[PDB]
Design an enzyme around this catalytic site. Structure first.
Site, PDB file in Angstrom:
ATOM      1  N   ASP A  78     -15.144 -21.136 -11.747  1.00  0.00           N
ATOM      2  CA  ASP A  78     -14.223 -21.501 -12.423  1.00  0.00           C
ATOM      3  C   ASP A  78     -13.948 -22.843 -12.095  1.00  0.00           C
ATOM      4  O   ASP A  78     -12.405 -22.602 -12.043  1.00  0.00           O
ATOM      5  CB  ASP A  78     -13.644 -20.386 -12.541  1.00  0.00           C
ATOM      6  N   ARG A 124      -6.385 -25.261 -13.812  1.00  0.00           N
ATOM      7  CA  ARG A 124      -5.709 -24.195 -13.404  1.00  0.00           C
ATOM      8  C   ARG A 124      -6.073 -23.345 -12.111  1.00  0.00           C
ATOM      9  O   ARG A 124      -5.094 -22.531 -12.169  1.00  0.00           O
ATOM     10  CB  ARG A 124      -5.539 -22.975 -14.799  1.00  0.00           C
ATOM     11  N   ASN A 125      -7.166 -23.214 -11.264  1.00  0.00           N
ATOM     12  CA  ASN A 125      -7.539 -23.086 -10.293  1.00  0.00           C
ATOM     13  C   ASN A 125      -7.434 -24.139  -9.286  1.00  0.00           C
ATOM     14  O   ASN A 125      -7.754 -23.950  -8.149  1.00  0.00           O
ATOM     15  CB  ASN A 125      -9.084 -22.903 -10.356  1.00  0.00           C
ATOM     16  N   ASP A 133      -9.328 -19.911  -6.244  1.00  0.00           N
ATOM     17  CA  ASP A 133      -9.765 -19.004  -7.371  1.00  0.00           C
ATOM     18  C   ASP A 133      -9.060 -17.930  -7.433  1.00  0.00           C
ATOM     19  O   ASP A 133      -8.324 -17.269  -6.426  1.00  0.00           O
ATOM     20  CB  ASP A 133     -11.068 -18.055  -7.676  1.00  0.00           C
TER      21      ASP A 133
HETATM   22  C1  UKI Z   1      -1.690 -20.563 -13.347  1.00  0.00           C
HETATM   23  C2  UKI Z   1      -1.681 -19.715 -12.003  1.00  0.00           C
HETATM   24  C3  UKI Z   1      -2.254 -20.359 -10.572  1.00  0.00           C
HETATM   25  C4  UKI Z   1      -1.706 -19.207  -9.621  1.00  0.00           C
HETATM   26  C5  UKI Z   1      -1.858 -19.002  -8.628  1.00  0.00           C
HETATM   27  C6  UKI Z   1      -1.281 -18.113  -7.953  1.00  0.00           C
HETATM   28  O1  UKI Z   1      -1.332 -17.612  -6.374  1.00  0.00           O
HETATM   29  C7  UKI Z   1      -1.152 -18.528  -5.166  1.00  0.00           C
HETATM   30  C8  UKI Z   1      -1.433 -18.563  -4.088  1.00  0.00           C
HETATM   31  C9  UKI Z   1      -0.574 -20.180  -3.243  1.00  0.00           C
HETATM   32  N1  UKI Z   1       0.286 -19.927  -3.598  1.00  0.00           N
HETATM   33  C10 UKI Z   1       0.970 -20.224  -5.069  1.00  0.00           C
HETATM   34  N2  UKI Z   1       1.918 -21.164  -5.271  1.00  0.00           N
HETATM   35  C11 UKI Z   1       2.709 -20.663  -6.156  1.00  0.00           C
HETATM   36  C12 UKI Z   1       2.531 -20.359  -7.704  1.00  0.00           C
HETATM   37  C13 UKI Z   1       2.874 -20.417  -8.641  1.00  0.00           C
HETATM   38  C14 UKI Z   1       4.387 -21.092  -8.743  1.00  0.00           C
HETATM   39  C15 UKI Z   1       4.828 -21.028  -7.261  1.00  0.00           C
HETATM   40  C16 UKI Z   1       6.335 -21.642  -7.482  1.00  0.00           C
HETATM   41  S1  UKI Z   1       6.420 -22.877  -8.403  1.00  0.00           S
HETATM   42  O2  UKI Z   1       6.740 -23.320  -9.440  1.00  0.00           O
HETATM   43  O3  UKI Z   1       5.764 -23.671  -7.904  1.00  0.00           O
HETATM   44  N3  UKI Z   1       7.763 -24.125  -7.525  1.00  0.00           N
HETATM   45  C17 UKI Z   1       8.605 -22.906  -7.353  1.00  0.00           C
HETATM   46  C18 UKI Z   1       9.690 -22.513  -8.754  1.00  0.00           C
HETATM   47  N4  UKI Z   1      11.287 -21.479  -8.807  1.00  0.00           N
HETATM   48  C19 UKI Z   1      11.201 -21.748  -7.861  1.00  0.00           C
HETATM   49  C20 UKI Z   1      12.439 -22.498  -9.509  1.00  0.00           C
HETATM   50  C21 UKI Z   1       3.840 -21.048  -5.553  1.00  0.00           C
HETATM   51  N5  UKI Z   1       0.039 -19.980  -5.916  1.00  0.00           N
HETATM   52  C22 UKI Z   1      -0.299 -17.405  -7.701  1.00  0.00           C
HETATM   53  C23 UKI Z   1       0.435 -17.345  -9.131  1.00  0.00           C
HETATM   54  C24 UKI Z   1      -0.998 -18.341 -10.525  1.00  0.00           C
HETATM   55  N6  UKI Z   1      -0.125 -19.281 -11.782  1.00  0.00           N
END
Ligand code: UKI
Length: 306
Positions: free
Chosen positions: A171, A175-176, A189
């Site tokens: 995949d 998005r990954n 993943d």
């Molecule tokens: C499209 C998608 C991929 C994905 C992967 C995930 O597992 C993981 C694994 C490890 N790390 C992270 N970091 C992470 C994931 C989503 C949001 C954020 C925080 S952000 O939106 O980039 N910046 C903060 C925004 N706010 C505080 C203002 C960090 N996700 C968790 C959710 C996910 N959504």
């Protein structure tokens, strides 16, 4: 009705390893009471990924933000087994700078928790889309071409690592890919954190499949190899150098679509791809799988361009 299944596969000779038969190395075990959970980062039909502070993790007894994968409390025994298999695969593969690394696990005294690196900037697809909007606004820093080449090179390196361990991702897509400190890209993943059942990028077929990312031999014959990952990587390159457009924009997935791809139809050059980056994309979309580049060839080429 979809099931929660192990995404990555490891080649044995193609004979695949049965991940349920892999061993879980207890060197990873971490006390669940030493996690303090924060916000949920994403959730799907089977589980979620939650940020957490881990107290005393690793050799340095670090206190740091981590990401924790977990199933819903109502998970079936079959799904708990799949989460354990994913955990065992991560332990089997080892660590690399350009993958989202395993840091620990909680397997005793409650539900299985898989602790991974936390990536501060989230997924690459949302990042590119938000940066594009930020750059149009005037009409933190803006993107430049070298940034896109770096992201591309870093993903290729992570994939070259996985391929070197005989591991198939199945995949590969923006998005990954996550971005961490220093905006360094890491492949992982994250289906567990994704609402795949309501995601238009996954098509019902036979199973919810990311058809617009899939090599024709995966679509037609359910064959998955490192070379089919290279095809998907070419689609990822198109995502990067379009700043996050959807692949084959506006085209309905139907019999005609499948036939076109089988017959050699390819997306046109994205707006921000240099000619030779588009040529790499086209090379990844060779219909003969062994004619496609290797991830090491892609890595060395993109490192040079950057
Ligand atoms: C499209 C998608 C991929 C994905 C992967 C995930 O597992 C993981 C694994 C490890 N790390 C992270 N970091 C992470 C994931 C989503 C949001 C954020 C925080 S952000 O939106 O980039 N910046 C903060 C925004 N706010 C505080 C203002 C960090 N996700 C968790 C959710 C996910 N959504």
């Amino acid at each position: 009705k979809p099931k929660y299944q192990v995404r990555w596969k490891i080649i044995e000779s193609y004979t695949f390893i049965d991940p349920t038969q892999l061993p879980y190395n207890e060197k990873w075990e971490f006390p669940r009471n030493n996690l303090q959970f924060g916000k949920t980062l994403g959730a799907g039909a089977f589980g979620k990924v939650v940020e957490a502070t881990a107290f005393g993790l690793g050799k340095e007894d670090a206190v740091l933000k981590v990401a924790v994968k977990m199933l819903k409390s109502t998970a079936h025994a079959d799904e708990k087994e799949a989460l354990m298999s994913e955990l065992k695969i991560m332990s089997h593969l080892g660590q690399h700078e350009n993958i989202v690394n395993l840091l620990g696990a909680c397997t005793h005294g409650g539900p299985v928790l898989v602790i991974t690196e936390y990536c501060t900037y989230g997924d690459l697809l949302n990042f590119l889309r938000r940066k594009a909007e930020a750059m149009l606004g005037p009409s933190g820093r803006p993107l430049e071409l070298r940034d896109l080449l770096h992201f591309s090179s870093q993903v290729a390196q992570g994939m070259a690592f996985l391929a070197s361990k005989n591991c198939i991702h199945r995949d590969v897509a923006a998005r990954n890919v996550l971005l961490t400190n220093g905006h360094v890209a890491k492949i992982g993943d994250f289906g567990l954190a994704r609402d795949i059942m309501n995601d238009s990028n996954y098509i019902v077929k036979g199973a919810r499949l990311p058809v617009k990312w899939m090599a024709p031999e995966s679509i037609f014959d359910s064959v998955y190899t490192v070379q089919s990952d290279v095809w998907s990587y070419g689609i990822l390159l198109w995502e990067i150098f379009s700043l996050g457009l959807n692949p084959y924009p506006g085209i309905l997935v139907n019999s005609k679509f499948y036939k076109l791809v089988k017959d050699g139809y390819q997306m046109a050059q994205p707006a921000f791809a240099p000619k030779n980056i588009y040529s790499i994309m086209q090379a990844c979309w060779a219909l003969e799988p062994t004619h496609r580049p290797t991830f090491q060839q892609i890595t060395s080429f993109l490192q040079e361009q950057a």
